[PDB]
Each structure stands twice: as structure tokens, then as C-alpha cells.
Design a protein around this ligand. Structure first.
Ligand SMILES: NC(=O)c1ccc[n+]([C@@H]2O[C@H](COP(=O)([O-])OP(=O)(O)OC[C@H]3O[C@@H](n4cnc5c(N)ncnc54)[C@H](OP(=O)(O)O)[C@@H]3O)[C@@H](O)[C@H]2O)c1
Ligand SMILES: NC(=O)c1ccc[n+]([C@@H]2O[C@H](COP(=O)([O-])OP(=O)(O)OC[C@H]3O[C@@H](n4cnc5c(N)ncnc54)[C@H](OP(=O)(O)O)[C@@H]3O)[C@@H](O)[C@H]2O)c1
Lengths: 263, 263
């Protein structure tokens, strides 16, 4: 089964690479610039081209261009009833339908950048008119790069952005936060980075393996009048977790704003 | 080579389990309570006992009882010049020396709880009088459970506590913070937990694999006027990273306080 990508950038290359490891797809990437077709061909060994070939109802098309270039990109594309996925932000299924001239055979994806390493999380959404078999085809495609999470309401696609879409940046911010607290305690940049990385990696593996509630895990290791308690009381006083929720709201507000730009 | 543990609790059981996987040590755990000797013997298959046997200069002794019970535990122990490690908090090498009646053959360890799963970080400290070969013996012991970091100054053992010692609790707190922001966005408890876990696990793997600066990684994925930028501007306004450094200071202050209790 053919999987065409419209757009040869990072997300396209993550999912294409994903599909190559999975096996049994024919990958093909339309991308206007030669430079980056050169890379894909050398690294993944996928076919590429400046334009798409004729599509058929038995193909998949993955739309992977930046949102603002999407209407132009889709302008003269004839899907011929192919299954369409899109990974572009802020472009609703109805907007996508318009762009492509009426087809409803569309699944939306909100992936994130650890998918580049097979650790992604992809929010997924399809209207009711989209068959279960098409959902399953889309779902196995996005599972080549990580976790899928299907949503009932297209609106929750903003929640995904707020949590898993932009969340890796929050984690980088918090890694850096801990690295910097380590430098303040007298560690050189090398130790402070290693400390912070290993701290996060090991706490996260513990949470994963136990499946215990995050809060239950925090409390299990915060005896009253002890060192951990002093730190987490400071976190609480400065409303750290709350500010995290505020940041998420500001992110989801802005995703909502941005989406009104094209519908 | 024999490795005796004084204390059969969680840290003792983590490092013993570590040593079993490594291979080639004879593990033996003194622990007064039967109940928990029963576990260790069934799970790890290590010898245990209520008391220690006669020790020799060719043994290792790992001191692993709670700090306040340590002076009593060591009261009638004769190390006979055995290499001693201690994983107890807030008990300096000099204090340990007193406790054991003058020996200087001591390496201090500040481990953390992901060592339970081979993902630990252990701060390490020895006085100058402690030979390189003894440091290396201690260092291979603590490497059975994760990363080691050797320090020049015993004082930095408080910095380790502040960063890697208590840090897993901070990560649980921040996992929960993100989980809660997800619930506020309309996800059920199951999705919110999975979202948050996978977000942290995948960002951390990305940071690890790239080795790129945490801040450089955050900025790489925070285009101006975009969704991520709104969130991280909120984080900055509420001084999240700073409060993290404050929490670390409060933790390290308290570790310092607690250590004055026994010297
Ligand atoms: N980071 C995330 O959370 C994540 C999640 C969800 C969605 N996304 C989405 O991923 C998409 C791209 O992101 P990216 O980081 O991968 O950006 P990118 O590297 O710039 O990829 C976009 C590519 O589209 C190509 N393109 C534009 N018009 C074309 C045309 N009509 N024919 C063939 N190719 C064309 C461009 O290639 P040329 O150089 O030849 O012009 C460009 O390289 C966006 O829609 C974004 O919303 C990212
Ligand atoms: N979480 C961390 O960051 C980490 C890091 C560094 C250090 N530590 C240290 O780890 C040590 C123990 O922590 P834990 O969580 O493992 O506590 P724990 O489960 O209570 O282990 C302590 C054990 O010592 C035993 N014990 C006391 N007196 C004894 C005696 N003299 N003879 C034989 N056994 C005796 C007790 O066994 P009984 O039931 O028989 O009395 C008890 O189970 C502490 O010193 C702490 O400072 C933890």
C-alpha cells in the first residue's frame, strides 16, 4: 500500500522513517526543494519527487506541509477518494475538506517530535462518516512512531497540542531548570546536565514501571520535616504545578486563535 | 569478595540486587527483623542474618540503616579494617569514623530510588587518605545500580541530595502537574496519565540521544507568536524554573540542618 507524503519536512520524515521500520508500505514523498529530497533518498531510501503522481482510492495521502502553505499545496491535488491524513496544526477536518474539494475521507493527526525516535504521542480525530477500517489504517500508520490517542471531539485536538504537542518543550524547560539549580549548588555544566538528565530519566522509568499514581509516588518519598518536603513546599508556595496548568491554557488559547486564521 | 550490608531496607535491597546482576560478589545482609530477611532470601537469594559475622580487612561493609539508628547499630561492630561504604544521609565521614571507632577506610554514597531499577545516580565521596583502589571497589559497587558522581568536597553531598537525591520527587510532582493540566483540558484520568508519562519519557529520550543543550532544545521548538511560546512565557512570568532552584536551596538547607544533628 502506497503512502504519499505532501511535504518532506521533519514530521513527514519521522513518520516515513517509522513506516520503513514497520515494513510493507510503499513510501513516496513529494517535496518541491531538491536539497531535502536528496537527504530522504540517502537516509531512508524512500522514493521522492517534486510533485505527486496520480492518486487512487486505494492510496494513503499524508498532508504534511505547514498550515499556511496548505491551501495552495492542495489546490490542484486530486485525491480520487484516497484516504487522507493530515498532521498540520490548526486546520480542521472541514477546512481540509474544502482545500481538497469535498472529500470527507480524512483523519487528523497531532504528532509530537519524539516520534522522530519512535517515542511520539499522536492525538487522532476523524468525523463519524469515516469508517472503522480507515481509522485502523490511519492508526497503524501513526503507531509506527509511538502512542495514538483517539478523540471524540475535534476540539480536544487543542488539548493534545497543549499537553503532548508542546509538552516536550516544557520538559526541556524543566530539565534546564534542574540543571541550573545544580550549577547554583556548585556543579560544573557537565555534572549538572548529567544529574538532571538521569534524575528525570530514572523518575520517569520508575513511574512507568510501577504504574503508581504520580502524586502517590511523590508522597511515598517525601517524609514530613525532611529534605524533599522542604523543596516540594517551596514548589507549592510558588504554585509551580498551577503555573504549568496556566501555561497549558495559554498554549491551548493560542492554538484556538491560530486555527481561526483558516476557518 | 564479601559484601556485608548493615540494614536490609530498600537501599540495601537495591544495591544487593544490583550486585547480584553484576555477578561475582558474596552478598550477606544483617537485618534484625525476620520478616524482611524472609523477603530478601526469597527474592534475591542472598544470605541474611540477624547479626553480622566476623569481618576482615578483605571484606566490604555497606552501612544502610537510618541515620538516627546508626550510632547504636555501629556500637559494637568491629570492622577489622574492612572497606566501609555508607548510604546514610547526613552522616559525614568523620562522624562515621567515630561511630566505628576510628577507621578512616570509608567511602560515602548518596544514592536515589531509581537505583531500584538500575537507573540510579549515586554521589560519592572519600577523604584523600582513601586509596584509589578502594575508591574503584566502591565505585564498581555503586555502578551496579546506575551512574556514579565523585565529589571533591563532602559539602557537595548536600547538592546531590538537593538535585538527584530528592529530584525524583520533583519529577513525580511535575508529572502530576502535567497530568492535572490534561484533566483540566478535558482528558480522563487514564489519558491524562498516559499523555504526561509519554510526554516526559519521549522528551527525556530526545535530550539523551541528541546530547543537545536543554535550553537549546527548548528554543529549537518554540517559534515566536506560536503555541509553545505562550506556555513557556507563562512559565517564565510565574518564575517556574526559579522556584525549582528555590526548592532545591530549601532542600539543601534542610539536609545541612539535619546533618548538624549528629556532628
Ligand atoms: N511539532 C509538532 O507538534 C508537530 C505536530 C503536528 C503537526 N506538525 C506539522 O508538521 C507540518 C510540517 O512541520 P515540519 O516541522 O515537518 O516543517 P517543514 O520541515 O518545513 O516541512 C514542510 C515541508 O513541506 C514542503 N512543501 C511545501 N509545499 C509543497 C508542495 N506543495 N509540494 C511538495 N512539498 C511541499 C516543504 O518543502 P520545500 O523545501 O521543497 O518547500 C517543506 O519542507 C506542519 O503542517 C505542522 O503543523 C508538527
Ligand atoms: N532515598 C534516598 O535518596 C536514599 C539515598 C541515600 C541514602 N538513603 C539511606 O538509606 C538508608 C535506609 O533507607 P531505607 O529507605 O532503605 O530504610 P529502611 O527500609 O527502614 O532500611 C533500614 C533497615 O535497617 C535495619 N536495621 C536497623 N538496625 C539494625 C541492626 N543494627 N542490625 C541489622 N539491621 C538493622 C532495619 O531492619 P529491621 O526491620 O530488622 O529493624 C531497617 O529495615 C538510610 O540510612 C538513608 O539515609 C536513602
Amino acid at each position: 500500500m502506497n503512502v504519499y507524503f505532501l511535504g518532506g519536512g521533519n514530521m513527514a520524515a519521522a513518520v516515513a522513517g517509522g513506516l520503513v521500520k514497520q515494513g510493507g508500505y510503499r513510501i513516496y514523498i513529494a517535496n518541491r526543494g531538491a536539497e531535502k529530497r536528496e537527504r530522504l533518498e540517502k537516509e531512508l531510501g524512500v522514493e521522492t519527487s517534486a510533485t505527486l503522481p496520480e492518486l487512487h482510492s486505494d492510496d494513503v495521502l499524508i498532508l504534511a506541509v505547514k498550515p499556511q502553505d496548505m491551501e495552495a499545496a492542495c489546490k490542484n491535488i486530486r485525491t480520487n477518494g484516497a484516504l487522507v491524513l493530515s498532521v498540520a496544526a490548526g486546520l480542521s477536518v472541514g477546512t481540509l475538506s474544502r482545500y481538497l474539494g469535498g472529500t470527507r475521507r480524512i483523519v487528523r493527526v497531532m504528532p509530537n517530535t519524539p516520534g522522530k525516535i519512535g517515542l511520539g504521542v499522536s492525538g487522532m480525530y476523524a468525523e463519524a462518516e469515516v469508517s472503522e477500517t480507515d481509522r485502523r489504517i490511519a492508526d497503524r500508520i501513526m503507531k509506527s512512531v509511538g502512542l495514538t490517542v483517539w478523540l471524540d471531539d475535534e476540539e480536544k485536538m487543542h488539548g493534545i497540542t497543549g499537553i503532548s504537542g508542546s509538552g516536550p518543550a516544557y520538559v526541556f524547560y524543566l530539565l534546564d531548570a534542574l540543571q541550573n539549580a545544580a550549577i547554583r549548588q556548585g556543579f560544573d555544566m557537565a555534572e549538572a546536565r548529567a544529574l538532571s538528565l538521569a534524575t528525570f530519566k530514572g523518575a520517569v522509568a520508575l513511574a512507568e514501571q510501577t504504574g503508581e499514581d504520580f502524586e502517590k509516588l511523590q508522597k511515598n518519598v517525601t517524609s514530613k520535616g525532611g529534605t524533599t518536603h522542604e523543596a516540594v513546599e517551596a514548589f507549592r508556595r510558588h504554585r509551580v504545578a498551577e503555573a504549568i496548568s496556566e501555561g497549558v491554557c495559554a498554549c491551548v488559547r493560542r492554538s484556538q486563535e491560530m486555527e481561526r486564521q483558516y476557518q
